[PDB]
Symmetry: D2
Subunit: 419 residues, 4 copies
């Protein structure tokens, strides 16, 4: 089924077909002069997919307030319906990331709806950073690293429950992010809390299917404001290495200290085989969870430069999980997810344009200026024509947001859903 | 009224009286050898007050979750009852800061309850960073700087209402903090938004009594994650200077960029007569709103060093409004506010111990090492006995938190108030 | 001519075909957006940024300096090198001097500049280091030093810089000092600032009627605890206190982590105190890296505020533009060339912004389309416009490639003796 | 004796009575808390931290260096000054050397050290600067340089540092390099690290059975975009890859803004890779300021982890302790004296923490009492313990005061020629 009428997509695409042809052919000629086949790039871009977060489909908020828009999804089923729109128009988000218990519902029904909408499911996300009604033990002072054994056991059981749900819908991985930490010096014994965490994660690893992966996600701060158990990639590496081959690290772009060189962290984790995946978003101050590439587009490109280089260096068995983790506080969530997915493909496309042979030469000769310019020649290239053509060829929209607005989808769901 | 039984306070004080006498006399002898009269210091500490936030007596949370404890205060009246405990035990928080509409209630009743509990009211706090039921215009895209004229007018009216309520309860100032800003480049035109803000603030300024102050509070980010209209002290100064004599700047410790020298900002504002007051708290990463001095006690001392220098260099017309602005997510709000107020008095007392003449000499001679050591000699002094004695002589508790726990107050209000339930934070 | 004309011609001809194809393609795309590429190119060829004399030689850190070959020996060699940057990019007609580093007969400096086709931008005083025969040391400060005679000495130095500038064609004085403290208590913040203000007031008195005085703020370094002119707030107080001729200079790498620099730029413009810019890039501190090499979007956002100012009709707005960088691991001439190019790049993209559309989205609070309006301009590869602007003004289509083809570095390496002690 | 014994005796006697009163008062206070002050003093007396040879001379920034009088030049002058710090504080018996800065005949270094009552701590190699007559430059790196011969030269240099150390009593080699990049693309992160790891393996092979190899991470400077050994995560990978004799060195000012450094310390201890510390304080970047002069509580929290490690009976925990600072506006000897004192101050306060009480509050999630348990120790003025520890071991009750009374600075100023009067 199509959430957006096919006649609307066809109409809006035809309206922009002429200009796209001119832009695509122009870029094709430019790339040909540079020894690059535009068709080879478009072919790869069409195959790049990033999972959308169910928790980002509705309007997000802060501790100060939440300003919902119209037609807010009422639950996971409305969220899947909205996710279907993002995938139909961009063709870059076939899978959805779920969070339990936020999206708890009959697994069988979830799968049925997904299949009908043309959507799959990515990594499951457990939730032991908030309390649910009727919960025996509170996570106020922690979960997997809580001082109380019964509380840790409850958190472990919750994670195993997440795996059972995932197995029923087609998921093949579990992502574990917890708020565990301290707000005051002395509140926690750093080593003992980490020892407790490692023991708990070992239990989860024991219950992990042999065709699944277990991802741990580090974060410098928030909700903990003095110390956090899984605070950075160093601790994250120790966790993954300790647990086993099926355990890897997940890197969320906005979870690092000010000025951190994130692309180097990505490179390091790849070298030691522990880069499990990404949580894309952008930021300026803290874990802002803004639209990917809206603040620092070059940084996003540099991260993708490391991913493409890995393939170029001949790294084997490298298939990181790509996911968007954002909060949309002042825009239509669907529109932001659409453009964010587009920006991620944009950075990927540019990274594919880098002349690896030239770059390697400049690195070996220590020609820093030409090396940086080699990256810039790729990054400065406006790859929008490739992104639009990729969408057009695969059933998507040349201009996703414009088509979304022309369809009147938001007004439609606003009438179907309570205010 | 006495939220805490007098017999409990007397009991816990007597139990620690012996140790206090020993420590106070020892410190007195040490200070005497240093040419300082401990009595003179204690006398000033007993008179240092800081306002408590009504929204701080309840458990706080983040966008991810909120984990309420037992006996959570229901409304402003319950909150005032809890604030009364902090003041009775520390004797450092006689005034309370209100936020409207959160604490909206009959001005007559509010004043009546305060007088009964022995509490006064500090600066009023307007709220246009969240929407209230029945609100005609949403503040989603701003308030005082919103592009829609009707929305700015609605925000101006709300602030004027806050002034009216304050006038009725004895308040003498209005603090304006808004979330106004953008999350994306291009979303807002920085200059146009600021022009709108200034014009709206001018309307609010017109409704200020002749003896009132209007405080604008800067904040680098949150809830806006790309730009904020009142983002730093520079913009804040421009605001105060533009509005008039009654407009001043409020400095909240956790609202600055990483590594900012905050004490210098305080000095600069004092020099140009625009330091309206402070919002005390501590932090390590962002606007963490943690207990004052729990993370960086020396920084708190350095801020007070600038304040005492002004309080010593005879800075005429200098009475900054001191207030605690914190969020208590993992502790009993009352206990944290108690120790936070204590830490603020600790930094103040230590600043009073600085040999100003010696410091001036080392500064003039460019003797950096002795100048810094002159500050350290005061800062390293354990002034707890002075704080404890000040509390004891004024009706407080030698050990506030110990006494609070011995009284069983939390268990009491827990039985009187409905049970709470954990939930989300707004994400 | 520092670079043989035949070389510039040969290299331009080699790349003529490709430039034609790219420029014409871009022109058609811009036309579809309602933008005249010729109007943009005409403005770009007139955008100038001053090159720092102190950035023509290899720079270093407190740990070490690794000089390359043919390092300039003095201001005359430096001007000769600046002439190369201007001949090839045509974006750097003026040079920024530092006294006493570049002290020499004003008449001879002017003669060399005229002969090379170069002018002089704002003078830069130096009271952050001690020169020979100095009566008082600047170890503990200069314009804000506790010792009156030391402040007087610093004032005289700045007045001397003005005299030198008047003789060579300069019209402004930039004052950046290291004054500050490394320990709490070392300085009385307020008194140190008052001392600074009194000294600057004296310097202001020596300003010709058509001169400007720029003060430059910096969060830290060389002072590691407090700095007298630490941020734009203090900087504004300075400018406002001194008078109409006094304005603030914004050096991109001088702000706290995560600071919204483009907002500071807008605030200063609103209150008429944006004197100028010191362009460079950074990631950690005052790194002084090549402009746009680390965060190109931020540079574009700064230029977006500068172009918006014109769009709003701000009157008498002519900020001074200067590059202030340190080239530690590259040929200084090549880095200055590409940095000047990046600045024109950001400027050109800022000119492409559809401000009619942007104003609409801002009024309607359409944050997504507003940000996308800025991105449509920023994502545009304007290299063809920069290259054509150079071709038509006597410059090189590919400046660095032409510089390398000329063999200039090897030439000066043979002419200049390297320092031995 | 660098400082006359009569002067030390006189200045101690002058302050003896006051110390007695303060020590007895603190003794009574600690007694009421169940702690024996004599036990704490005994431990403090045994805590030592190495002094940097490169720290007794006045330091500077890339902008300037303002030397004081009697500047030590050469390792012999430096050892003479380091001897003053040890004599007065009794907390710095060993000196950290840097090669080639301190190159000299080992036989003479040892002879001078023995005569002054000084030993030698970890050796520090230097491949972040070029020495005259060097075959290959380190401009673009050293142990991770793309050129094989350059990496070999750097490895040989480090092996030479081990040879010198073996002859003078050292038992470790600390390796800090500037290797990194200033521009994206300049270096391939992974390849550069592979080159570094291979070179370090060669150095590891030359380590005696009882030696340790310390690698030191640093976020930035001299490299301003990326650094090979940028943080503790990379450092851990290095130590674990090299072998049991390789550990990580933590320099306090080498971390990103707001980093929780004490946790990094705890993590390294848990996995047996905490090799040692480089103490100093900072506010902005790698400021290299006097330890505890900016954030004393943070220093205490670091020592809280060190004391807790022993409380838990950790194995393989014998960290080296060294001061790594730059003294730009103070008498280097006085700053090192007070910095060593501040380190012992934090240690003493960490020893006062009631571990039993703390553990109880941690298990019960009583965050407020847990933090107040740390504060009760930290708020305690342990100066009497530090002064008594010095008095009992031949040191000065008030080190800096005694140093000033001795007239030592004026003495060496008269023996050492400055560049200018
Ligand atoms: C973006 C990244 O690029 C390369 O590393 C591989 O193709 C990998 O599968 C992909 O995820
Ligand atoms: C802003 C924040 O809001 C809630 O979480 C609480 O009222 C808390 O005390 C306050 O600090
Ligand atoms: C006494 C006082 O000292 C400083 O604060 C300033 O110089 C101020 O102007 C003066 O009034
Ligand atoms: C790196 C720096 O170099 C010099 O300035 C001095 O040796 C100083 O002590 C050191 O910290
Ligand atoms: C001089 C050098 O400086 C580095 O930044 C690091 O701190 C090293 O430990 C030190 O030896
Ligand atoms: C007494 C004199 O003191 C100097 O400081 C130096 O150590 C000389 O070597 C010694 O002869
Ligand atoms: C909802 C999801 O678990 C969450 O966003 C985490 O992944 C992490 O980003 C939190 O800061
Ligand atoms: C509730 C109160 O208005 C609030 O705390 C503001 O003062 C400011 O700190 C917000 O970040
Ligand atoms: C050389 C010039 O005065 C200097 O670079 C200043 O402008 C400032 O950037 C210093 O950090
Ligand atoms: Mn995430
Ligand atoms: Mn950045
Ligand atoms: Mn997150
Ligand atoms: Mn506040
Ligand atoms: Mn700090
Ligand atoms: Mn706040
Ligand atoms: Mn500058
Ligand atoms: Mn600079
Ligand atoms: Mn070090
Ligand atoms: Mn260092």
């Amino acid at each position: 089924e199509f959430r957006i009428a096919q006649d609307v997509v066809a109409r809006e695409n035809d309206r922009r077909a002429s200009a796209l042809k001119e832009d695509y052919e122009a870029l094709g000629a430019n790339l040909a002069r540079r020894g690059v086949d535009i068709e080879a790039v478009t072919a790869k871009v069409e195959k790049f997919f990033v999972a959308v977060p169910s928790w980002g489909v509705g309007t997000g908020g802060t501790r100060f307030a939440r300003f919902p828009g119209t037609g807010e999804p009422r639950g996971i089923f409305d969220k899947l319906d909205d996710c279907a729109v993002i995938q139909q128009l961009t063709r870059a988000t076939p899978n959805v990331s779920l969070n339990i218990p936020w999206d708890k519902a009959d697994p069988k029904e979830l799968k049925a709806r997904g299949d009908a909408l043309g959507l799959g499911f990515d990594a499951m996300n457990s939730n032991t950073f908030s309390d649910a009604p009727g919960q025996a033990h509170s996570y106020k002072y922690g979960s997997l690293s809580h001082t109380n054994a019964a509380t840790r056991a409850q958190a472990v059981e919750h994670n195993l429950e997440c795996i059972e749900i995932g197995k029923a819908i087609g998921s093949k991985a579990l992502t574990v992010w917890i708020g565990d930490g301290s707000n005051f010096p002395g509140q926690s014994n750093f080593t003992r809390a980490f020892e407790r965490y490692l023991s708990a994660m070992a239990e989860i690893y024991k219950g992990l299917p042999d065709d699944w992966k277990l991802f741990s996600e580090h974060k410098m701060y928030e909700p903990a404001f003095y110390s956090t158990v899984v605070q950075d990639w160093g601790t994250n590496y120790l966790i993954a290495q300790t647990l086993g081959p099926k355990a890897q690290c997940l890197v969320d772009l906005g979870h690092h200290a000010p000025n951190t060189n994130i692309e180097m962290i990505v490179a390091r984790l790849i070298q030691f085989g522990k880069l499990g995946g990404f949580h894309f978003n952008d930021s300026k101050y803290g874990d802002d969870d803004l639209d990917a590439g809206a603040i620092e587009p070059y940084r996003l490109f540099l991260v993708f430069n490391e991913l493409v280089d890995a393939e170029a260096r001949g790294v084997k068995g490298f298939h990181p999980a790509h996911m968007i983790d954002q909060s949309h506080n002042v825009t239509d969530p669907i529109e932001s997810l659409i453009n964010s997915a587009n920006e991620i493909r944009r950075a990927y496309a540019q990274a594919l344009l880098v002349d690896r042979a030239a770059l390697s030469g400049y690195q070996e000769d220590n020609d820093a200026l030409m090396a940086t310019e080699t990256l810039k020649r790729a990054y400065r290239t406006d790859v929008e024509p490739i992104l639009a053509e990729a969408r057009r060829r695969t059933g998507g929209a040349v201009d996703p947001v414009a088509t979304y607005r022309a369809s009147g989808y938001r007004a439609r769901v606003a009438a179907e859903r309570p205010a």
